[PDB]
Design a protein around this ligand. Structure first.
Ligand SMILES: CCCCCCCCCCCCCCCCCC(=O)OC[C@H](COP(=O)([O-])OCC(O)COP(=O)([O-])OC[C@@H](COC(=O)CCCCCCCCCCCCCCCCC)OC(=O)CCCCCCCCCCCCCCCCC)OC(=O)CCCCCCCCCCCCCCCCC
Ligand code: BCL
Ligand code: BCL
Ligand code: BCL
Ligand code: BCL
Ligand SMILES: CC[C@H]1c2cc3[nH]c4c(c3C)C(=O)[C@H](C(=O)OC)c4c3nc(cc4[nH]c(cc(n2)[C@@H]1C)c(C(C)=O)c4C)[C@@H](C)[C@@H]3CCC(=O)OC/C=C(\C)CCC[C@H](C)CCC[C@H](C)CCCC(C)C
Ligand SMILES: CC[C@H]1c2cc3[nH]c4c(c3C)C(=O)[C@H](C(=O)OC)c4c3nc(cc4[nH]c(cc(n2)[C@@H]1C)c(C(C)=O)c4C)[C@@H](C)[C@@H]3CCC(=O)OC/C=C(\C)CCC[C@H](C)CCC[C@H](C)CCCC(C)C
Ligand SMILES: COC1=C(OC)C(=O)C(C/C=C(\C)CC/C=C(\C)CC/C=C(\C)CC/C=C(\C)CC/C=C(\C)CC/C=C(\C)CC/C=C(\C)CC/C=C(\C)CC/C=C(\C)CCC=C(C)C)=C(C)C1=O
Ligand SMILES: COC(C)(C)C/C=C/C(C)=C/C=C/C(C)=C/C=C/C(C)=C\C=C\C=C(C)\C=C\C=C(/C)CC/C=C(\C)CCC=C(C)C
Ligand SMILES: [Fe+3]
Lengths: 302, 240, 281
């Protein structure tokens, strides 16, 4: 048995680290929280400090209104009875406003008005948070990569419950807030469009989804296979290539005769993943608006 | 129709993306070369990208890639066949000469500095507040090689300050001097530390660092390289 | 044929079989005994797939499809035309996949690095044998395996799926989808992180791992770390596939009814089973 570097053999701890200051407003940061021996077995143990600030709160708050809004409704359903509430948690659901109401914000609560309310909260909770991720990287002088790729995630989210419903002419086309409730909508959406497996974008979406798992498995295992030379210390290998970066490239060179660099691979990474919700967002925007049946479409091609 | 338009657009896009992504991963190691070190004929269909310069922090200067690729070190190897494609046998001690699994890269002979300009790594006996917070403490435990014999004993733990992580075990050998072993290369057991790669009589062969309070990117590579190659080369001792 | 820094690595040794026999390269490609095996099992198969194509009277790729023996043949061999070729090609595929894995082990031994890669690969190879070997054998019929065809194998997915209603209800399939989604989240993040540190705003200094750990705490309050995210990556991945191989080994062998029905156990619990109202009652 030889150490495989999955879990540390020895944990070490020094004074709580407050992190780089740069142009961050330490006034808005918080205080360091507890250390976690459990967490420290896989990664960092230091919990906190976290930067709250304004934008953060808008989201952190807005995000509870959306959570609670649907929560109230769930109880209205379980007849304020806990036993029930707990029993049918996955079955409850805050459906969207019936087709009759259209895109109007006039549908009553028990008829899809509550859905509108909650969603609104979510729309705030996510966007404000998005601006947060762009801001916190600026304060540190970093690129806006994290913020940009998060947009791609937002993309699919925007199409599923906003862009498309609007293009369809009804707040009904949206997705219900419910565990099993939304699983059904998903299976349902497909059957109504001629089986998405025929959607060329969907099949592409899957390609990347799987690709993301293929890539991260390779990358993670590689970086672990050469950590005996300091692999995880990626940024430095980027400014000064070491054996780690080399043996790492040669392995894939001799395996599939084609390879990457310590920085390049991350470009493959961020792109591999990002394309999952970008292509997905597309395949879905076109379904129901330009294409009605993907089987029928897979035939005439338009 | 729109759908069919969008789908083709995407394939053109993806192509440009695979082009971009490929030429980006050619910033190092390229242009290919023959076994003799001269530029190979065909360099593939992809062209080296325009160069890019990094601004290393702490006034360490800059880095431009792709740039002139050099090994800036001698290679003790000799061909084993007349044709291309075969192994290059070592012409001395692969471990000493540092070839094959024992290879190392000539990196800057300075240590890595944290976001503050301080040596990212330090022997724990020089690190404030730092202590073994969990797990077994190796300090004091003896060290054994793959030949079931004792090479020396751990006298301190070198840690990463900013990422609070153990990275090396400063071991004391029979003659009083110390050597760094990669944390990722030893089994800290109940009553010892086991080193599978090397075998007792080789712990002295491990490279040594100058200052006894900081390791340089270069020295890390020779220490790490040397121990890894002990996996292949030391074998003629690794009984167990 | 070599990268500026490659020669010092092309030393003798590392092979598991045959010794110095196949210990040599071919362009960037390393060979090894197992480099030969994969060629063998791959040329063999491709051929079988080519022949299997003429017997189907089609050369078109979006149509060709080697089908498995019909349920009547059970777990016995079948006529090259009635699932025979399929059965053989599966052997070639399996053997090609294994030889490839072990080839990586040798590429590993030569470079003196860990065996994490060939190990993580084995999890895929595992899922594969879960579909073409374990589930079918437990169900006693090579017919429960999937077909080899671009879209024709997609049908298999869809049919096998709707055979139990919305397959969304399979509990494990439910866990596997979560790790798959998370893995993409984690990959998207890690890449944006490292890159945003090595590629800061114009004219600025290259950040450090420190600015990385900083960035996340500010954002989410915690930061797993440079070694952790690579640990998380390998884990999220292999898990997503583990649970995927799992949700299919239980389907059709220990549970063969609608998956949405399996949630009754929950809803039909003494304490609330009859408690009037809700969604169920
Ligand atoms: C319709 C869909 C609309 C839906 C909206 C969802 C959009 C999701 C966007 C996701 C973006 C992720 C990008 C990753 C990335 O690099 O981000 C950093 C990158 C740089 O960040 P930074 O912090 O400013 O700079 C740090 C360093 O200075 C510099 O750091 P750096 O070096 O890392 O960054 C440089 C980066 C600069 O990044 C970009 O320029 C991004 C380009 C965005 C593309 C958006 C995709 C649209 C999908 C089209 C598909 C068609 C289907 C319909 O360069 C690239 O990555 C180049 C990309 C290669 C593109 C190849 C195109 C080929 C076209 C075909 C050519 C002919 C073929 C020949 C055969 O971000 C951007 O440039 C922003 C892109 C956002 C545009 C949004 C569009 C508005 C709506
Ligand atoms: C996992 C559950 C189902 C399944 C469900 C689906 C679904 C659902 C979809 C696919 C799709 C795909 N599947 Mg599948 N698929 C299964 C099992 C397999 C097996 C196998 C050996 O068992 C293989 C090779 C494939 C391969 C493929 C790809 C052709 C295509 C996805 C692109 C991708 O990014 O893939 C991930 C891999 C990479 C990014 C790595 C690169 C590998 C390349 C792409 C392989 C090409 C192989 C070529 C087409 C076959 C060559 C055979 C010759 C003999 C050499 N599937 C099982 C049985 N598959 C998608 C599609 O669009 O299909 C038409 C899709 O929507
Ligand atoms: C029976 C049903 C249909 C079907 C119907 C659909 C439908 C309908 C859709 C998909 C979509 C997808 N399908 Mg499908 N799909 C089927 C079968 C398959 C099979 C298979 C092997 O059979 C596979 C591999 C897939 C795979 C996939 C994915 C590639 C893709 C979703 C990517 C993603 O990450 O989304 C998840 C990611 C997001 C939704 C991102 C947005 C997240 C937002 C920004 C975050 C909000 C956060 C909130 C405010 C915070 C909560 C946090 C708190 C801490 C709690 N499908 C069958 C045939 N599929 C989706 C797509 O895009 O398709 C093109 C989609 O709409
Ligand atoms: C892409 C096509 C479909 C779709 C198809 C599916 C399918 C198919 C499945 C899910 C599943 C899930 N989907 Mg979905 N889903 C869609 C859009 C969304 C949106 C959105 C804002 O648009 C959100 C927030 C979600 C959220 C979720 C999760 C609740 C759940 C997956 C776990 C996970 O790892 O998530 C990634 C996110 C994180 C790791 C971070 C946040 C996770 C939070 C903190 C925890 C949720 C816990 C859950 C409620 C706990 C139950 C515990 C009880 C003890 C049993 N979906 C679209 C419309 N979704 C899975 C499931 O198990 O469903 C029942 C599943 O199989
Ligand atoms: C209508 C159909 C049903 C459904 C039916 C099924 C069925 C049926 C199955 C799945 C399976 C899966 N489903 Mg589903 N699924 C549905 C809806 C969804 C949705 C959604 C958002 O709606 C999602 C996210 C998913 C997600 C998933 C995945 C978790 C899982 C497949 C990945 C996998 O196993 O990889 C595992 C990876 C492999 C098997 C690949 C192995 C690769 C081998 C080793 C190498 C090949 C090399 C190649 C030949 C080499 C080429 C070389 C050349 C040089 C290029 N499903 C709907 C409701 N789903 C599958 C599963 O769990 O499978 C185990 C499965 O069987
Ligand atoms: C290729 C695209 C992939 C992707 C990328 C992605 N996601 C991202 C990012 C990126 C690049 C971010 O930067 C952003 C992030 O911040 O990550 C850490 C994020 C993010 N992706 C998220 C989710 C998510 N991503 C998903 C998917 C994907 N993300 C894709 C796979 C999914 C799926 C699969 O469905 C989900 C659910 C969010 C967690 C996060 C953005 C956070 C956000 O929008 O927050 C608004 C705030 C709230 C909703 C707060 C309330 C939350 C709960 C409802 C209540 C309980 C919490 C409360 C704090 C408890 C307090 C308890 C007390 C006791 C203290
Ligand atoms: C288990 C976790 C994840 C993972 C990991 C993973 N994959 C890996 C590795 C790892 C760690 C490798 O090291 C290895 C690699 O070298 O990658 C570059 C690989 C790899 N993952 C691959 C594919 C792959 N991985 C997938 C998934 C995953 N891989 C998971 C998400 C998928 C999916 C989900 O679709 C696919 C297609 C290969 C490209 C590659 C290994 C290549 C290899 O073994 O090559 C030699 C093989 C041949 C010559 C095979 C021919 C065999 C037969 C003669 C004919 C074909 C028969 C086959 C049944 C036909 C199928 C047709 C379809 C239309 C249905
Ligand atoms: C530490 O950083 C890292 C690196 O380096 C610094 C890396 O390189 C990589 C990996 C490298 C990449 C470039 C990532 C790219 C992205 C992908 C999504 C790759 C997977 C997709 C593919 C399409 C690869 C194609 C696969 C193969 C195997 C092509 C080989 C072609 C053949 C014809 C097979 C050869 C056949 C046989 C039988 C071998 C024997 C040969 C004889 C001649 C005999 C990672 C993850 C990394 O993290
Ligand atoms: C224990 O009890 C308490 C009280 C603590 C509460 C507990 C809470 C519970 C039990 C919450 C349960 C909620 C769940 C499980 C929610 C699940 C949601 C899921 C699975 C998916 C969500 C899909 C939604 C997407 C598609 C939504 C997209 C929304 C938008 C793009 C914005 C929509 C915009 C609208 C309607 C317009 C508003 C107006 C403007 C300004 C444009
Ligand atoms: Fe990385």
């Amino acid at each position: 048995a030889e150490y495989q570097n999955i879990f540390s053999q020895v944990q070490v701890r020094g004074p709580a680290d407050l992190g780089m200051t740069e142009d961050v407003n330490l006034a808005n940061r918080s205080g360091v929280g507890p250390f976690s021996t459990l967490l420290g077995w896989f990664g960092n143990a230091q919990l906190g400090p976290i930067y709250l600030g304004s934008l953060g709160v808008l989201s952190l708050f807005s995000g509870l209104m959306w959570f609670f809004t649907i929560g109230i409704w769930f109880w209205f359903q379980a007849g304020w009875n806990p036993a029930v509430f707990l029993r049918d948690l996955f079955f409850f659901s805050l459906e969207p406003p019936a087709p009759e109401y259209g895109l109007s914000f006039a549908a009553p609560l028990k008829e899809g008005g509550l859905w509108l309310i909650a969603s609104f909260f979510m729309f705030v909770a996510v966007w404000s948070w998005w601006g947060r991720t762009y801001l916190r990287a600026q304060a540190l002088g970093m690129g806006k990569h994290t913020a940009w790729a998060f947009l791609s995630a937002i993309w699919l989210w925007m199409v599923l419950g906003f862009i498309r419903p609007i293009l369809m002419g009804s707040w009904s086309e949206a997705v219900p807030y419910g565990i099993f409730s939304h699983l059904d909508w998903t299976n349902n959406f497909s059957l109504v469009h001629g089986n998405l497996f025929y959607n060329p974008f969907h099949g592409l979406s899957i390609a990347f989804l799987y690709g993301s798992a293929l890539l991260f498995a390779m990358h993670g295992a590689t970086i672990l296979a050469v950590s005996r030379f300091g692999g995880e210390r990626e940024l430095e290998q980027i400014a000064d290539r070491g054996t780690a970066a080399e043996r790492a490239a040669l392995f894939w060179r001799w395996t599939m005769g084609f390879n990457a660099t310590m920085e390049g691979i991350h470009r493959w990474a961020i792109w591999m993943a990002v394309l999952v919700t970008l292509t997905g967002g597309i395949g879905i925007l076109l379904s129901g608006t330009v294409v009605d049946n993907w089987y029928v479409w897979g035939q005439n091609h338009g | 129709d729109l759908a069919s338009l969008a789908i083709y657009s995407f394939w053109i896009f993806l192509a440009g993306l695979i082009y971009y992504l490929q030429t980006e991963n050619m910033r190092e190691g390229y242009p290919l070369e023959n076994e003799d070190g001269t530029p190979a004929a065909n360099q593939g269909p992809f062209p080296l990208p325009k160069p890019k310069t990094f601004i290393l922090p702490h006034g360490r200067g800059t880095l431009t890639v792709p740039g002139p690729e050099s090994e800036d070190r001698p290679i003790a190897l000799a061909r084993t066949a007349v044709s291309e494609g075969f192994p290059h046998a070592p012409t001395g001690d692969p471990m000493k000469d540092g070839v094959g699994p024992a290879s190392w890269v000539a990196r800057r002979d300075l240590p890595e500095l944290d976001g503050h300009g301080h040596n990212k790594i330090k022997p724990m006996k020089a690190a404030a507040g730092f202590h073994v917070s969990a797990g077994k403490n190796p300090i004091g435990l003896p060290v054994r090689g793959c030949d079931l014999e004792i090479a020396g004993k751990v006298v301190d733990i070198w840690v990463d300050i900013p990422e609070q992580m153990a990275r090396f075990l400063e071991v004391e050998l029979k003659d009083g001097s110390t050597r760094l072993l990669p944390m990722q290369m030893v089994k800290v057991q109940s009553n010892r530390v086991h080193v599978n790669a090397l075998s007792s009589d080789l712990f002295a062969g491990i490279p040594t660092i100058k200052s006894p309070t900081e390791v340089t990117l270069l020295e890390e590579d020779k220490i790490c390289g040397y121990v890894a190659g002990g996996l292949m080369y030391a074998a003629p001792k690794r009984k167990s | 044929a070599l990268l500026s820094f490659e020669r010092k690595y092309r030393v003798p040794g590392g092979t598991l079989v045959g010794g110095n026999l196949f210990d040599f390269w071919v362009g960037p490609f390393y060979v090894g005994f197992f480099g030969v095996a994969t060629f063998f099992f791959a040329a063999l198969g491709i051929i079988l797939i080519a022949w299997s194509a003429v017997l189907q009277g089609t050369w078109n790729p979006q149509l060709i499809s080697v089908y498995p023996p019909a349920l009547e043949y059970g777990l016995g061999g079948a006529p090259l035309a009635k699932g025979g070729l399929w059965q053989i090609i599966t052997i070639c595929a399996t053997g090609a996949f294994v030889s490839w894995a072990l080839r990586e082990v040798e590429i590993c031994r030569k470079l003196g690095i860990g065996y994490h890669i060939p190990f993580a690969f084995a999890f895929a190879i595992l899922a594969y044998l879960t579909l073409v070997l374990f589930r079918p054998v437990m169900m006693g019929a090579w017919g429960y395996a999937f077909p080899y065809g671009i879209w024709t194998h997609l049908d298999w997915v869809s049919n096998t799926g709707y055979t139990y209603g919305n397959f969304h209800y399979n509990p494990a399939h439910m866990i596997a989808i979560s790790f798959f989604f998370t893995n993409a989240l984690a990959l998207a993040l890690h890449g944006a992180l490292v890159l945003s540190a090595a590629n800061p705003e114009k004219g600025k200094e290259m950040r450090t791992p420190d600015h990385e750990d900083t960035f996340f705490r500010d954002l989410v309050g915690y930061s797993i770390g440079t070694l952790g995210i690579h640990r998380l990556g390998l884990l999220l991945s292999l898990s997503a596939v583990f649970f995927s191989a799992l949700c299919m080994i239980i389907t059709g062998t220990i549970w063969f009814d609608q998956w949405v029905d399996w949630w009754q156990w929950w809803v039909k619990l003494p304490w609330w089973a009859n408690i009037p109202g809700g969604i169920n009652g």
